[PDB]
């Protein structure tokens, strides 16, 4: 295939004997995470919340807990987030971007820049019910001035939706974020928010391709020419997601890996969330921006356990 | 008239009287720029050369130095080029374009791929004596890999020439840029530089006309998809100049005012060096190419006396 999700439902899924064989892999000294891997990164999100119901039924014990206690590190942190329904995945994920006295402003942008409206309406509601504060409070409580802004607008919603086209709008938002940024000194930068925060996505598409036909410039590169910080960042993120997602995702995990280090918290979230959605995708377009395999990139750059359980993400 | 410069030498040329003209126009506070573009913009650079001697035996000054106190800006650097001797004048800009801790790779370009054979022995001989280091010397502190030896081959020249016509080489020519190219996994960049640097203008028209025949494709289109960077740039500039000098230069003034801004360099720079030679053809293949006068697009993008003197260059 060359389309869509790697990890699919599994065939003759059997859930009781999946919790058997998960019981048996961390029962006593030592760990089968072959076995673990090889059950849980070939099931489905789904399949695997049938498994967690199987094993408190037919274990008498808690299948998340038990993981928790027996794996550690990189490993543990992309079997537990593989073991966690999709909408409270991204939930913890922002949570723990802003729990405590940092903020990791590059996940908040992610998710926020990428979700589709449904998913952010989830995260909403399951957030608040989680924690009792919104998601919009403890962005502002974490973020200031204009990159606050763009994240309030991506959580409340409110994009034009659909995909009418007129012409003459499109063309007069590609001259006014000409005559915003570019043409003027300083930038309105109300302006872009304005339309990268409000059109629907067709209209932009037809709004960059204008835009580059007035200034002989990408909107990318007036962006980065124009604005600084995590305000540039918010904005190249929704120009990125609206283009092609896959290819947003695809330079999320290049940068998480290429040059010295290796941001495993990206590559595990980005890994673990996409691997239902686009991951075919993804590695379709990390192939083409970047001449090397995503498969390829991350068996360089991890190890272990936590490598062989990214590779079958990966496919 | 339709083809060849647009500046030619003055009737009634009196340099004594010219040079008294100048002086007047400078001394004092201010200064008469309408009389020094007129006196100047109509004399063609042998005439000027005239002028700066007799400036020096009837006013007991010097013009080259009076210009550049009294005048400032881009105004300025047009009439310095004007009246600099045309290999001179090359011979500076690749000084200016390697100078220091940049490099202007364009300037490198556009003067290497587009001169004679003769003019570019000059401009050897002439930096070497100015300067006490070889052009080739500097080019290869400045530049690398297959950028570097594009450019030294242009200034080695060798390319054989005159223009005998042997069908056969042509085809295998076209079949083995082909075969280096498109229709394998990377590229032989050696054998573009080898065909495109050595080749005569007659037998490379020839071949490109065959590469389209056989690929689907012109051979600018597979230079831009095979190759990158200042390497590609010296390719298509060298096709470019093969095909049709006037419509290359016709490109390198687009591409400095059209957008965002003035490439003055380049402005200033094709307008001195081309005034004389193929301004006329080069206008003509502008408004071709892109269906405005050149003219226009000098008016809407200077101002000025810059804009005054640039407009009688174009004529
Ligand atoms: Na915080
Ligand atoms: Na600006
Ligand atoms: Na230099
Ligand atoms: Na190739």
């Known amino acids: 295939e060359t389309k869509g999700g ?3 439902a599994a065939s003759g899924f059997n859930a009781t004997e999946d919790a058997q064989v998960l019981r048996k892999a961390m029962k006593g000294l030592g760990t089968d995470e072959d076995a673990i891997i090889g059950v849980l990164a070939c099931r489905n999100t789904a399949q695997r919340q ?17 993981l928790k206690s027996e794996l ?16 409270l995945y991204d939930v913890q994920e922002l949570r723990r971007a802003m729990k405590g006295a940092g903020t990791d402003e590059g996940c908040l942008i992610e998710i926020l820049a990428s979700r589709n409206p449904e998913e952010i309406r989830r995260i909403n509601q399951t957030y608040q019910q989680q924690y009792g504060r919104s998601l919009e409070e403890d962005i502002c409580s974490d973020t200031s001035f204009m990159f606050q802004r763009v994240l309030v607008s991506l959580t409340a919603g409110g994009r034009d939706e659909g995909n009418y086209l007129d012409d003459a709008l499109v063309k007069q938002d590609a001259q006014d974020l000409y005559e915003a940024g570019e043409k003027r000194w300083g930038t309105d ?6 339309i990268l925060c409000s059109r629907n996505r067709n209209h932009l598409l037809h709004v960059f391709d204008e835009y580059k036909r007035i200034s002989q410039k990408d ?6 020419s124009e604005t600084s910080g995590s305000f540039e960042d918010a904005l190249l993120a929704i120009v990125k997601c609206m283009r092609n997602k896959p290819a947003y995702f695809a330079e999320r995990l290049y940068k998480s890996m290429k040059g010295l280090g290796t941001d495993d918290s990206t590559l595990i979230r980005v890994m673990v969330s996409r691997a239902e ?8 377009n990390f192939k083409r921006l970047y001449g090397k395999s995503l498969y ?3 068996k360089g750059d991890t190890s272990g356990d936590y490598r062989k359980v990214l590779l079958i993400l990966c496919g």
Do not use: C, W
């Open 296 to 298: 390829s990139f991350i």
């Open 277 to 284: 959605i686009d991951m075919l995708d993804i590695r379709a």
């Open 6 to 8: 790697t990890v699919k």
């Open 50 to 66: 049938e498994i967690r119901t199987a094993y408190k039924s037919t274990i008498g014990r808690d299948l998340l807990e038990d």
């Open 72 to 87: 550690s590190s990189n490993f543990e942190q992309v079997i537990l987030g593989m073991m966690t329904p999709t909408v």
């Open 189 to 194: 930068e109300v302006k872009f928010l304005s």
């Open 219 to 224: 909107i990318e590169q007036s962006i980065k």
